[PDB]
C-alpha cells in the first residue's frame, strides 16, 4: 500500500498517512520538530480499487487546525491523486477555510496546490 | 445577450460590452476579458472570463464562468482573487469563491 507513510512538500510540511484496506485515510500533520503541540489529526478517503493501468488513485483528506493546545479556527482539505513508482507523488489542490463572520465569509477560503513526495527536502 | 449591466448577489455591478470577435470590456475599476463569440447551439452556455485589477488594493480578481440566456439570464462564475504579497506569504495569496450575476438587482 504505497500511500501509507510519510509525505512532504517543498515547504516541507510533513504528513504521516495510513491507508486502510477499504478506503480510510488517517494520520497526522507533524511539525518539523514533531511534538504533540504542533500535531493535528488528518482523516480522509481514497479509491481502494483504482484502475491498474498506471492511472492515479483519487483521494482527499482534511485537517482541522485545532489540537489540545492551539486553535487556528480553520481547516484545510486536500484533493488529488496518488501516483506510485520510484518517484511517487501525491498531486493535490487544497482549500483552506477559516471561520469568519457572515460579512467576511466571502473571503474565508484560500486555494493552492501541493505536491507531496516521499523524500524529505 | 452579454452586453449590458449585471448585478452580483452582494451589491456589485458589472457593466460590460461584448465585442463581435470575443472581447469583453467595461467597468466593475476597469474590466477586460474574453468570451466565446460563437457558442454551441446544443443548450450549452457561453464560456467567458474577465479580470479586474483593483487599482489601490494591490490585487486582482478573475471570474471564470458561463453566460446562460433567456428570461432568467445569468452569468454563473467562480473567481480567484490574488493579492500582491511577499514571497513568504505567496502560498496564501489567492482566495476563491463564486458569483452569480443577473440582469436585475
Amino acid at each position: 500500500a504505497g500511500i501509507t507513510g510519510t509525505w512532504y512538500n517543498q515547504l516541507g510540511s510533513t504528513f504521516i498517512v495510513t491507508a486502510g484496506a477499504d478506503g480510510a485515510l488517517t494520520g497526522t500533520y507533524e511539525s518539523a520538530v514533531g511534538n504533540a503541540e504542533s500535531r493535528y489529526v488528518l482523516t480522509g478517503r481514497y479509491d481502494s480499487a483504482p484502475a491498474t493501468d498506471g492511472s492515479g488513485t483519487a483521494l482527499g483528506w482534511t485537517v482541522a487546525w485545532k489540537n489540545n493546545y492551539r486553535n487556528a479556527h480553520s481547516a484545510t482539505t486536500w484533493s488529488g491523486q496518488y501516483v506510485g513508482g520510484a518517484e511517487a507523488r501525491i498531486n493535490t489542490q487544497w482549500l483552506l477555510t477559516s471561520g469568519t463572520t457572515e460579512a467576511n465569509a466571502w473571503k474565508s477560503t484560500l486555494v493552492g496546490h501541493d505536491t507531496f513526495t516521499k523524500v524529505k527536502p | 445577450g452579454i452586453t449590458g449591466t449585471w448585478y452580483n448577489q452582494l451589491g456589485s455591478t458589472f457593466i460590460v460590452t461584448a465585442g463581435a470577435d470575443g472581447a469583453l470590456t467595461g467597468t466593475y475599476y476597469v474590466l477586460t476579458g474574453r468570451y466565446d463569440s460563437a457558442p454551441a447551439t446544443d443548450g450549452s452556455g457561453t464560456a467567458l472570463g474577465w479580470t479586474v485589477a483593483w487599482k489601490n488594493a494591490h490585487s486582482a480578481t478573475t471570474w471564470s464562468g458561463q453566460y446562460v440566456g433567456g428570461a432568467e439570464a445569468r452569468i454563473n462564475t467562480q473567481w480567484l482573487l490574488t493579492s500582491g504579497t511577499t514571497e513568504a506569504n505567496a502560498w496564501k495569496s489567492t482566495l476563491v469563491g463564486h458569483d452569480t450575476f443577473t440582469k436585475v438587482k
Partner: peptide, 7 residues
Amino acid sequence: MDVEAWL
C-alpha cells in the same frame, strides 16, 4: 500550504 507559517 505553508502549515508552519499558518499556525
